[PDB]
Each structure stands twice: as structure tokens, then as C-alpha cells.
Design an enzyme around this catalytic site. Structure first.
Site, PDB file in Angstrom:
ATOM      1  N   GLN A   1      45.451  49.323  63.718  1.00 31.29           N
ATOM      2  CA  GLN A   1      45.526  47.938  63.267  1.00 31.29           C
ATOM      3  C   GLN A   1      44.655  47.015  64.111  1.00 31.29           C
ATOM      4  OE1 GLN A   1      46.295  47.718  60.311  1.00 31.29           O
ATOM      5  NE2 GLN A   1      47.799  46.053  60.359  1.00 31.29           N
TER       6      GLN A   1
ATOM      7  N   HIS B   1      51.929  41.857  46.631  1.00 35.01           N
ATOM      8  CA  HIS B   1      50.552  41.662  47.105  1.00 35.01           C
ATOM      9  C   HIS B   1      49.720  40.736  46.168  1.00 35.01           C
ATOM     10  CE1 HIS B   1      46.498  42.486  48.590  1.00 35.01           C
ATOM     11  NE2 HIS B   1      46.168  42.891  47.381  1.00 35.01           N
TER      12      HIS B   1
ATOM     13  N   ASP C   1      42.691  38.398  50.032  1.00 37.33           N
ATOM     14  CA  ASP C   1      43.104  39.798  49.933  1.00 37.33           C
ATOM     15  C   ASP C   1      43.638  40.331  51.258  1.00 37.33           C
ATOM     16  OD1 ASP C   1      43.589  42.320  48.758  1.00 37.33           O
ATOM     17  OD2 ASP C   1      41.485  42.824  48.456  1.00 37.33           O
TER      18      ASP C   1
ATOM     19  N   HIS D   1      50.320  47.879  47.086  1.00 32.62           N
ATOM     20  CA  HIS D   1      49.528  47.313  46.010  1.00 32.62           C
ATOM     21  C   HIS D   1      50.317  47.082  44.728  1.00 32.62           C
ATOM     22  CE1 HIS D   1      46.058  48.543  48.516  1.00 32.62           C
ATOM     23  NE2 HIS D   1      45.583  47.414  48.016  1.00 32.62           N
TER      24      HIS D   1
ATOM     25  N   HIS E   1      43.695  40.954  40.526  1.00 31.29           N
ATOM     26  CA  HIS E   1      42.670  41.759  41.181  1.00 31.29           C
ATOM     27  C   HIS E   1      43.060  43.217  41.517  1.00 31.29           C
ATOM     28  CE1 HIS E   1      44.616  41.126  45.088  1.00 31.29           C
ATOM     29  NE2 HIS E   1      43.844  42.112  45.503  1.00 31.29           N
ATOM     30  N   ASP E   2      44.323  43.545  41.383  1.00 32.11           N
ATOM     31  CA  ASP E   2      44.739  44.886  41.740  1.00 32.11           C
ATOM     32  C   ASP E   2      45.536  45.527  40.618  1.00 32.11           C
ATOM     33  OD1 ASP E   2      43.483  45.631  44.280  1.00 32.11           O
ATOM     34  OD2 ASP E   2      45.101  44.690  45.421  1.00 32.11           O
TER      35      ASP E   2
HETATM   36  C1  VIA Z   1      42.720  48.440  50.579  1.00 31.62           C
HETATM   37  C2  VIA Z   1      43.680  48.034  51.723  1.00 31.62           C
HETATM   38  C3  VIA Z   1      43.061  46.995  52.671  1.00 31.62           C
HETATM   39  C4  VIA Z   1      44.114  46.570  53.666  1.00 31.62           C
HETATM   40  N1  VIA Z   1      45.017  45.637  53.441  1.00 31.62           N
HETATM   41  N2  VIA Z   1      45.754  45.521  54.434  1.00 31.62           N
HETATM   42  C5  VIA Z   1      46.895  44.522  54.543  1.00 31.62           C
HETATM   43  C6  VIA Z   1      45.437  46.364  55.432  1.00 31.62           C
HETATM   44  C7  VIA Z   1      45.951  46.625  56.716  1.00 31.62           C
HETATM   45  O1  VIA Z   1      46.903  46.008  57.216  1.00 31.62           O
HETATM   46  N3  VIA Z   1      45.346  47.613  57.452  1.00 31.62           N
HETATM   47  C8  VIA Z   1      44.256  48.344  56.949  1.00 31.62           C
HETATM   48  C9  VIA Z   1      43.672  49.274  57.811  1.00 31.62           C
HETATM   49  C10 VIA Z   1      42.288  49.309  57.975  1.00 31.62           C
HETATM   50  C11 VIA Z   1      41.702  50.196  58.875  1.00 31.62           C
HETATM   51  S1  VIA Z   1      39.967  50.286  59.132  1.00 31.62           S
HETATM   52  O2  VIA Z   1      39.349  48.900  59.174  1.00 31.62           O
HETATM   53  O3  VIA Z   1      39.777  50.886  60.514  1.00 31.62           O
HETATM   54  N4  VIA Z   1      39.209  51.101  57.898  1.00 31.62           N
HETATM   55  C12 VIA Z   1      37.992  51.757  58.441  1.00 31.62           C
HETATM   56  C13 VIA Z   1      37.014  52.209  57.312  1.00 31.62           C
HETATM   57  N5  VIA Z   1      36.665  51.088  56.389  1.00 31.62           N
HETATM   58  C14 VIA Z   1      35.616  51.503  55.425  1.00 31.62           C
HETATM   59  C15 VIA Z   1      37.888  50.539  55.744  1.00 31.62           C
HETATM   60  C16 VIA Z   1      38.932  50.094  56.818  1.00 31.62           C
HETATM   61  C17 VIA Z   1      42.497  51.034  59.630  1.00 31.62           C
HETATM   62  C18 VIA Z   1      43.876  50.978  59.480  1.00 31.62           C
HETATM   63  C19 VIA Z   1      44.464  50.099  58.589  1.00 31.62           C
HETATM   64  O4  VIA Z   1      45.813  50.024  58.414  1.00 31.62           O
HETATM   65  C20 VIA Z   1      46.626  51.088  58.940  1.00 31.62           C
HETATM   66  C21 VIA Z   1      48.026  50.472  58.989  1.00 31.62           C
HETATM   67  N6  VIA Z   1      43.773  48.067  55.723  1.00 31.62           N
HETATM   68  C22 VIA Z   1      44.347  47.090  54.954  1.00 31.62           C
HETATM   69 MG    MG Z   2      41.868  45.747  45.924  1.00 33.92          MG
HETATM   70 ZN    ZN Z   3      44.137  43.644  46.963  1.00 36.77          ZN
END
Ligand code: VIA
Ligand code: MG
Ligand code: ZN
Length: 324
Positions: free
Chosen positions: A282, A82, A229, A78, A118-119
Site C-alpha cells: 500500500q 465503489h 477512482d 468493485h 465506470h465499473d
Molecule cells: C483497479 C484497482 C485500483 C485500486 N483501487 N484501490 C482502492 C487500490 C488500492 O487500495 N491499492 C491498490 C494497489 C496497488 C498496487 S501497485 O501500485 O503497486 N500496482 C503496481 C502495478 N501497476 C501497473 C498497478 C498498481 C499495489 C497494491 C495495491 O493494493 C494492495 C492492497 N490498487 C487499488
Molecule cells: Mg475501473
Molecule cells: Zn473504479
């Protein structure tokens, strides 16, 4: 600093085509900090925002550098890169994806400002972490803590002397623009995305989507923001893989804090002991959050398919690793 500003204001801004910023495949990885500021100037230019709003060159440059500086370099993911990428995805969504002539100039102005803002001042840590650790920011704000802070930082920068890129606007247009900027920033809270998804998806699913309706326009804009985002999920594989380790680095640092400050077991996403689980996680991410979203944006605009394509290709790759 005053030197980086003189560097930037004097430089030639290459064309949108030369800089590759209309590609949904765009990569920042081998651009200098200076080159990213140059790209941003181009973005503001080719969306006709400099012309339509009387932005002085020197002023836009100082604002762009102000933003860049208020991201924290030590934060794994972040940070400025980004924010810049998010704006570039917006720019491609507007240009290549043809969303541009579905929106007014004031909306586009708002979205691009929001994308870059935004961040702002992110600390590499959640809203949950901020809440639970009793951090000061959770006495000023009671919902979307980080996102509210990001808007405040943005507002603070648009209004510091020498940086007022909105000054060409009438009091009426200014108030309108900030309102859109605020909603756009608040929309980058995943909780609020999850909360409003279903309404957007039903509109699409029943062929009742219509930008003429004020309420739907607002919704669509929120969705757009989330789309941009999360857009690293749609990039070619070498890029996505690299960006995923950054995000993981950032999570693992939070898990550390959660083990020591909060005294709890961090969730797999956030535990470095389960570094092994990154692929499966992922895949789960893509399935639950991303694919459905890019599927919908593609209904709104045929030409945004490359985002959904990219997303599906990254799913195959992660899934292949999830079985080793
Ligand atoms: C705030 C960050 C959001 C985000 N950005 N990016 C690029 C990613 C990403 O690549 N992966 C994940 C991510 C999300 C979940 S999730 O969808 O399973 N998680 C579950 C609960 N919710 C409420 C939020 C997302 C699990 C693992 C993740 O990355 C690990 C490398 N989030 C983001
Ligand atoms: Mg954000
Ligand atoms: Zn962001």
C-alpha cells in the site's frame, strides 16, 4: 423492485449539507442502499443537472436503480459502493474543490454519469486476467477490455426505455456527451493514466496548464477521473483500512484463478500467502501512483488539498504497520 422504485420516487431528498456529501471525508459505510440512491439524486440536483436538462424525477430514479442493479454485489470491492463513492468524490471535487466553474454543464453531466457508470458489471478481475484466460470479452475488444465493456453497459442503460436521462438533449449535444463519457470511462484504466501522467505533470511543473485548450481539457478530465477512482486512498484511516481489505479480498480471489486457470505464481499484490505484505504494498501504491496525482490536482485547485492531506496521513499509517 417496482417497489424500490416507488420507495425512491416518493422519498424526500435531504440537502447536500445534511447528507455530508460535500465532505472529502464522506463515508458510505453506514448508509442503506436506498440512502445512497437518495444521495445520488441530490448530486444530480445540486450540480443543476435536473434543471438544465429536463430530467423527469421518475426517469432519473429508474436510471439510478438500473445502474445500482448492474453492479455485482458478490464482487468484494468493485461493486455499487465503489461506483457511488467515486461519484461522491467527483461531486466534492466539483463543489468543495471548486472545479465546477472550470467546466461546462455538458462536461459535468458527462463526468457524473461516467463516475457512476465506470465499473459496470465488473467481475472482480483484471484486464490481464481476462486477456490471458481467453475470456469472451477479449474477442470483442483488444485494448482496455474491461473499460470498453463498462462503457457498453452504460450506453446500454442510458438507452433502455424508462431510463433515458439524456433525452432532453439535441442530437448534437447527445453525441458530444457520449464522446466525453466514453473518454472518461476509458480514462479509469490505470494503464492509460500511467501513459499520460507525464504530459499532465510537465504542464503543471512549467506553469503552462490552461483549460481553454481543447487538448488540455481532455487530459485534465482523464486525470480527474483517476483522482476520484482512487479516492479511497485519501479517506480517514478507519475507512481506508476497511476498504483496503476489500481490495485485497478481490486480488486474492484473482490470484486463486491465476494459480488454477493460468497455472502461474500470482504477484505478491495478488497472493494470499503474502497477506503479511499488505502494508508495504500500500505504501508502494501510494508513492508510485497516488501522491503525485493529488499533488497536481492541488495545483489545479487549492481547495482540493484535503485529498492530498488524506493521502499523506494514510501513508504514515501504513508505513507504521510496515515496521509492525
Ligand atoms: C483497479 C484497482 C485500483 C485500486 N483501487 N484501490 C482502492 C487500490 C488500492 O487500495 N491499492 C491498490 C494497489 C496497488 C498496487 S501497485 O501500485 O503497486 N500496482 C503496481 C502495478 N501497476 C501497473 C498497478 C498498481 C499495489 C497494491 C495495491 O493494493 C494492495 C492492497 N490498487 C487499488
Ligand atoms: Mg475501473
Ligand atoms: Zn473504479
Amino acid at each position: 423492485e417496482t417497489r424500490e422504485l416507488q420507495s425512491l420516487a416518493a422519498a424526500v431528498v435531504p440537502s447536500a449539507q445534511t447528507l455530508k456529501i460535500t465532505d472529502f471525508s464522506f463515508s458510505d459505510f453506514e448508509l442503506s442502499d436506498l440512502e445512497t440512491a437518495l444521495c445520488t439524486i441530490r448530486m444530480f440536483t445540486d450540480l443543476n443537472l435536473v434543471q438544465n436538462f429536463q430530467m423527469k424525477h421518475e426517469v432519473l430514479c429508474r436510471w439510478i436503480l438500473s445502474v445500482k442493479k448492474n453492479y455485482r454485489k458478490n464482487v468484494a470491492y468493485h461493486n455499487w459502493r465503489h461506483a457511488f463513492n467515486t461519484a461522491q468524490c467527483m461531486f466534492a471535487a466539483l463543489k468543495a474543490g471548486k472545479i465546477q466553474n472550470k467546466l461546462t454543464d455538458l462536461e459535468i453531466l458527462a463526468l457524473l454519469i461516467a463516475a457512476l457508470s465506470h465499473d459496470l458489471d465488473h467481475r472482480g478481475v483484471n484486464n490481464s486476467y481476462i486477456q490471458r484466460s481467453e475470456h469472451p470479452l477479449a474477442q470483442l475488444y483488444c485494448h482496455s477490455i474491461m473499460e470498453h465493456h463498462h462503457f457498453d453497459q452504460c450506453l446500454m442503460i442510458l438507452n433502455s426505455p424508462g431510463n433515458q436521462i439524456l433525452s432532453g438533449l439535441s442530437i448534437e449535444e447527445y453525441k458530444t456527451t457520449l464522446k466525453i463519457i466514453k473518454q472518461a470511462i476509458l480514462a479509469t484504466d490505470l494503464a492509460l493514466y500511467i501513459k499520460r501522467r507525464g504530459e499532465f505533470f510537465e504542464l503543471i511543473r512549467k506553469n503552462q496548464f490552461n483549460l481553454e485548450d481543447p487538448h488540455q481539457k481532455e487530459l485534465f478530465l482523464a486525470m480527474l477521473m483517476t483522482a476520484c477512482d482512487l479516492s479511497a486512498i485519501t479517506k480517514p484511516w478507519p475507512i481506508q483500512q476497511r476498504i483496503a481489505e476489500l481490495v485485497a479480498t478481490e486480488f486474492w480471489e484473482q490470484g486463486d484463478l491465476e494459480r488454477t486457470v493460468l497455472q502461474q505464481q500470482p504477484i505478491p499484490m495478488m497472493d494470499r500467502n503474502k497477506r503479511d505484505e499488505l502494508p508495504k504494498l500500500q505504501v508502494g501504491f501510494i508513492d508510485f501512483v497516488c501522491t503525485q496525482l493529488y499533488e497536481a490536482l492541488t495545483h489545479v485547485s487549492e481547495d482540493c488539498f484535503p485529498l492530498l492531506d488524506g493521502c499523506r496521513k494514510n501513508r504514515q499509517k501504513w508505513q507504521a504497520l510496515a515496521e509492525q
